[PDB]
Design a protein around this ligand. Sequence first.
Ligand SMILES: O=C(O)Cc1ccccc1Nc1c(Cl)cccc1Cl
Ligand SMILES: O=C(O)Cc1ccccc1Nc1c(Cl)cccc1Cl
Ligand code: NA
Length: 584
Amino acid sequence: EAHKSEIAHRFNDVGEEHFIGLVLITFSQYLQKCPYEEHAKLVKEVTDLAKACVADESAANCDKSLHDIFGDKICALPSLRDTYGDVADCCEKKEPERNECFLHHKDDKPDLPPFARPEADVLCKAFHDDEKAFFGHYLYEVARRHPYFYAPELLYYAQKYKAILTECCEAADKGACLTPKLDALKEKALISAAQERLRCASIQKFGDRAYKAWALVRLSQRFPKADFTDISKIVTDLTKVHKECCHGDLLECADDRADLAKYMCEHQETISSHLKECCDKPILEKAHCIYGLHNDETPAGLPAVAEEFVEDKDVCKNYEEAKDLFLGKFLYEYSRRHPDYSVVLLLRLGKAYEATLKKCCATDDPHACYAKVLDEFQPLVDEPKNLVKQNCELYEQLGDYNFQNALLVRYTKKVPQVSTPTLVEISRSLGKVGSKCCKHPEAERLPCVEDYLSVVLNRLCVLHEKTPVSEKVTKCCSESLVDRRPCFSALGPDETYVPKEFNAETFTFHADICTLPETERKIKKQTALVELVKHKPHATNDQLKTVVGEFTALLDKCCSAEDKEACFAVEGPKLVESSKATLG
Ligand SMILES: O=C(O)Cc1ccccc1Nc1c(Cl)cccc1Cl
Ligand SMILES: O=C(O)Cc1ccccc1Nc1c(Cl)cccc1Cl
Ligand code: NA
């Protein structure tokens, strides 16, 4: 059917610069293993096409879908050697199968080196040398390692990075200005990637409704003075935005997100007085500001929630005749009254309210049956608090490195079939929850911890879905979204797993470790700890500290200030004996 060219429409809407960045992230996320040169080629072809179509919408290919265009550019690049498999695989398909094929190949942990950070002088020099190649490489490296990174926010990070560089690269000492600041930016962007990967998994694995309910809760806490209608409209629009982003339709995602920020800012009077801060800012800063805005204050003088949800004669009628409208109003009313609760807790409270209606509205006297419903939330609210206190005390007491080691041991004993790199990455990230949340006062501490654990446990679920080995992980991952944390927390040691019979011997890498920073060295020690627990799951915590001690020792030894060939292979069978000494 006759239409306005989609590529020209999106090119026109977002401008060349964001179009180029969004297209580079598109390619880098679909073909994570192809070199930068290849992607650069592709992005230039797409950008020449878009400019051709903007000039004359009738030009060849201008009427095609964005999927057709990305697909044909990909398939027609002979360069794509197929030394990288599956390029032909998906190119065999017609649309829409082709695009689905490219999409099903996104790898949540592609086989790549940690993103090595050059020294500050080099970094500053490359930036000065050529900004476009510098930021091209940056978007490519971050997108291909995080193939569901929320695309407009990745653009925003690139701008933030550029500001840090501009400020630090003139300084007397570049490194010391730069390093804390790149570090803080990296942590915020990792949290962003983890938050977005949970939105995408909620949509993909549990359906649009799972994310709509999550967004309803969060937005009702952020904008509690807004009416239900406006909140619902925002949720609707944000749902479309994240579905498009999570499915690789990034130009549409970015366009639609900008339109949503424009909308919210034009209606800021009836949403939040806090929006004024954001609404004066330029495009990416404006949306980023809105994305994480602090909660507005609760409106004074709202009725008791039991009026509408317990005492109304029509509770059953509304639940039966308009369930999503009634339960969504419940989530809105209850959430706007409780900014201090975690989203996941509010969703679990919504689920328990629903289950009580399902049961009670089927009886002879439903009010009698659900009268105590809102009271019956207290035990769900209170449930975490003792184990949270004890885990924050553990953290307070142990410090980061030992808290991570405690959790590594705990989670390896729970789900010991999980791959060692996954258990290490997961436990380290659980340890960051300690660090980020325990230092808040308790009223802030319980909501911080609950929602961060949901983002880390989702990382576990998605990594396990790639290499699936543990029935228990499958079960907790697939049974729910909102009970994942109680589900994992409830697991004791798996007394059923068969210990690994290990001569862990020659699991030493020719002293490779020494170009590695203290950080990676810690990861290595933590990897050995996981391996110790899988070999001896009934070992004492003290035995583990010790057999790890003998690891640290043998590390420094062959890795000293002198050069010798193969010190490790005489010492592998003999650490094997020293670990047979402490562990049996
Ligand atoms: O670990 C538990 O079972 C208690 C609990 C409940 C809710 C949220 C978090 C936690 N624990 C917890 C805390 Cl409080 C901080 C860092 C890492 C972990 Cl696993
Ligand atoms: O694991 C715990 O519950 C804390 C605890 C208490 C006493 C001794 C060791 C540990 N944890 C622990 C472990 Cl299990 C391995 C390496 C390093 C440390 Cl601090
Ligand atoms: Na797509």
